[PDB]
Enzyme design. Sequence first.
Site, PDB file in Angstrom:
ATOM      1  N   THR A 118       0.850  -1.216   0.000  1.00 40.55           N
ATOM      2  CA  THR A 118       0.000   0.000   0.000  1.00 40.55           C
ATOM      3  C   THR A 118       0.874   1.252   0.000  1.00 40.55           C
ATOM      4  O   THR A 118       0.542   2.197  -0.732  1.00 40.55           O
ATOM      5  CB  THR A 118      -0.990   0.036   1.166  1.00 40.55           C
ATOM      6  OG1 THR A 118      -1.786  -1.143   1.046  1.00 40.55           O
ATOM      7  CG2 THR A 118      -1.958   1.182   1.117  1.00 40.55           C
TER       8      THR A 118
ATOM      9  N   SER B 223       4.894  -6.828  -1.986  1.00 42.67           N
ATOM     10  CA  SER B 223       4.633  -7.325  -0.603  1.00 42.67           C
ATOM     11  C   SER B 223       3.172  -7.109  -0.166  1.00 42.67           C
ATOM     12  O   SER B 223       2.801  -7.552   0.956  1.00 42.67           O
ATOM     13  CB  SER B 223       5.583  -6.684   0.336  1.00 42.67           C
ATOM     14  OG  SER B 223       5.401  -5.288   0.326  1.00 42.67           O
TER      15      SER B 223
ATOM     16  N   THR C 257       1.000  -3.971   4.492  1.00 42.89           N
ATOM     17  CA  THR C 257       0.609  -4.201   5.909  1.00 42.89           C
ATOM     18  C   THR C 257       0.096  -5.631   6.133  1.00 42.89           C
ATOM     19  O   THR C 257       0.261  -6.136   7.254  1.00 42.89           O
ATOM     20  CB  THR C 257      -0.429  -3.181   6.369  1.00 42.89           C
ATOM     21  OG1 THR C 257      -1.570  -3.356   5.516  1.00 42.89           O
ATOM     22  CG2 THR C 257       0.140  -1.772   6.368  1.00 42.89           C
ATOM     23  N   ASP C 258      -0.549  -6.263   5.151  1.00 40.24           N
ATOM     24  CA  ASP C 258      -1.279  -7.539   5.401  1.00 40.24           C
ATOM     25  C   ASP C 258      -0.320  -8.651   5.837  1.00 40.24           C
ATOM     26  O   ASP C 258      -0.757  -9.494   6.632  1.00 40.24           O
ATOM     27  CB  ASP C 258      -2.107  -7.952   4.197  1.00 40.24           C
ATOM     28  CG  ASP C 258      -3.408  -7.176   4.076  1.00 40.24           C
ATOM     29  OD1 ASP C 258      -4.013  -6.876   5.136  1.00 40.24           O
ATOM     30  OD2 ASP C 258      -3.789  -6.863   2.932  1.00 40.24           O
TER      31      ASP C 258
ATOM     32  N   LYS D 127      -1.351  -7.424  12.617  1.00 44.11           N
ATOM     33  CA  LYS D 127      -2.336  -6.470  12.070  1.00 44.11           C
ATOM     34  C   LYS D 127      -3.731  -6.794  12.645  1.00 44.11           C
ATOM     35  O   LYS D 127      -4.290  -7.845  12.341  1.00 44.11           O
ATOM     36  CB  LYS D 127      -2.338  -6.529  10.554  1.00 44.11           C
ATOM     37  CG  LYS D 127      -3.200  -5.441   9.931  1.00 44.11           C
ATOM     38  CD  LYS D 127      -3.073  -5.433   8.447  1.00 44.11           C
ATOM     39  CE  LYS D 127      -4.043  -4.518   7.753  1.00 44.11           C
ATOM     40  NZ  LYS D 127      -3.836  -4.543   6.279  1.00 44.11           N
TER      41      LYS D 127
ATOM     42  N   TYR E  86      -7.594 -26.408  31.881  1.00 42.19           N
ATOM     43  CA  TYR E  86      -8.861 -27.142  31.692  1.00 42.19           C
ATOM     44  C   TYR E  86      -8.536 -28.609  31.476  1.00 42.19           C
ATOM     45  O   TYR E  86      -7.531 -28.896  30.811  1.00 42.19           O
ATOM     46  CB  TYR E  86      -9.614 -26.643  30.447  1.00 42.19           C
ATOM     47  CG  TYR E  86     -10.341 -25.344  30.641  1.00 42.19           C
ATOM     48  CD1 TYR E  86     -11.717 -25.313  30.867  1.00 42.19           C
ATOM     49  CD2 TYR E  86      -9.634 -24.152  30.709  1.00 42.19           C
ATOM     50  CE1 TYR E  86     -12.379 -24.115  31.094  1.00 42.19           C
ATOM     51  CE2 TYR E  86     -10.283 -22.945  30.917  1.00 42.19           C
ATOM     52  CZ  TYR E  86     -11.655 -22.928  31.120  1.00 42.19           C
ATOM     53  OH  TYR E  86     -12.267 -21.730  31.343  1.00 42.19           O
TER      54      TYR E  86
END
Lengths: 331, 331
Positions: free
Chosen positions: A12, A55, A86-87, A157, A278
């Site tokens: 981006t 990327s 960013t992803d 993210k 648990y």
Amino acid sequence: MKKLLIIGTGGTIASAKTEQGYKSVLKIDEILKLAKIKLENGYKIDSTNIMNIDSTLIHPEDWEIIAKEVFKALDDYDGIIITHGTDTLAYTASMLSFMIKNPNKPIVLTGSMLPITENGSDAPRNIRTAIKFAMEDVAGVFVAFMDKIMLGCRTSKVRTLGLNAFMSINYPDVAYVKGEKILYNIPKEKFQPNGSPELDTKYEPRVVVLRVTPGLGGEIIDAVLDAGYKGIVLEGYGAGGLPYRKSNLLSKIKEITPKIPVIMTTQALYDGVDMRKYEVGRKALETGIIPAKDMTKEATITKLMWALGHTKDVEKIREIMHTNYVNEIKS
Amino acid sequence: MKKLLIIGTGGTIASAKTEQGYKSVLKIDEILKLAKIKLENGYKIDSTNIMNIDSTLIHPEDWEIIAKEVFKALDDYDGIIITHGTDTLAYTASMLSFMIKNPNKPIVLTGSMLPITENGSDAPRNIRTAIKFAMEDVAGVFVAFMDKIMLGCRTSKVRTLGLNAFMSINYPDVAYVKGEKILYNIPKEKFQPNGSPELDTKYEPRVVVLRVTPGLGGEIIDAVLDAGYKGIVLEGYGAGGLPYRKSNLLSKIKEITPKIPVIMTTQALYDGVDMRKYEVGRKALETGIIPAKDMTKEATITKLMWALGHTKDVEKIREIMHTNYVNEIKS
């Protein structure tokens, strides 16, 4: 005085709105020009592009390319910045944390939720924060985002639109930057060089990540192992268990844990997994499922791929996954 | 004056610490006794147990049982509370939101992060909040947690330890409760009965949920369809796309979208998916992948199972998934 290398990868931060939607179009020189980044004043910035990648959609082969380029640059630079989509930012940051052992310099990844050319773009702010931290006398792999410096192997993210898109998961932030002011949240003393840099790009990419859901059958485990996958990560429940009642999922996993690492992380974002609390968690543990503890999904996934590049022995993978290499996991 | 039904299902709220770890041991009568719940004062609480289940590990068959019991109770009760395990609370709340059309009463699910018998247990607080909201002249499926009332089909468990464990995802909270004070965040007027209650428990359970990760091959898609799975949910990237370069994942999905619903949600928690913003998202859309928009993973998964119980036609599934039934998804 200081030399910095800024490495472009697309994302981006490299994108512009077109008629086809956002498209990765900018080389790093254009990013720096359009974000009005100062290339001097007690430093010199040099720049370079990782060729034939975007990327926005990082491939694991790109991790090996970036790791080799960053490792070579350590000789010639006081600091290294990577601009990235960013992803998968957190996946690259985590994999570099395992492939570049004892970096003797800051390696700072950043990106932007908005292209430079969109109104109120975060790209200039994030590049500037990354430059300020890369000028610090520190060592490691970090992410700069929304004035925060975060340990790379602890970032996820958390949202798709909000500018405060990255969080440190189950670990404190490294620092906060207000201009020329760096406020260390973990002492600067804890990020000093300690042993000589080593490059290790071995990895097995065939790791499949499943969300644990009600009714998910053991047939899915047969399917992924017949597709020749070598590790399984489960985004599981906080109780850390899997059903025995009206279900073959736990019994089909117990059959394959001797030969395939099956890692239990969480579908929930915060606070990690504790398979001891648990009875259902203890039953899962007794099948040979490996807990991811407090690790991010991004660290768990990249670490297992890296671990499987070294060994097919599930006990050795169990030991690698629970070794704290770079504060990706609690001891 | 008012009649309330409290339905026990097991979970942490029904559990006690044993030598074997936490174990679901308490029937609803013991929960109410141990949490010191008032059974009267302008109301009468009756209680019942869904027999031979533990919602620590809910099975989809349990959704049908609970839906039938809740639907029958609508005749005889002003309000209905379900105590439930936290790990799949949001899945039961979401599936009930599709199986019980136009409930003419409040159906309030709650649980606890701590057993009643552990110090500082949240169980009493959460049961009390659920009782207070179930006494409101409203209709729908809600979750009561940490003084909040949330739309059931908008809840996700965001953490494994913290008491503030449930959030309303991409949607406002319904209300906040401070004692006998209910503060409506969405107007009370918007949760009034509108048409007659209908029960529809049709569903297909073979939905598999994958995290999209770098290097994930189209071989996984062949594997799950050869295991006879009928829907795929992808926890994808904010850009909403999948790679064409060094990858057959998008091309193998394009082959099977004519016959299998493939739903694109997010691995990120907040702000949803917009497959139009990026060129990579538009490429994914043009393969026939169905966007989950702003839906929770829990709503996406339960809605698709419910949708597939009605039809095998992917265009009809696409229309069902993008129909806003109960404010699970934006119009």
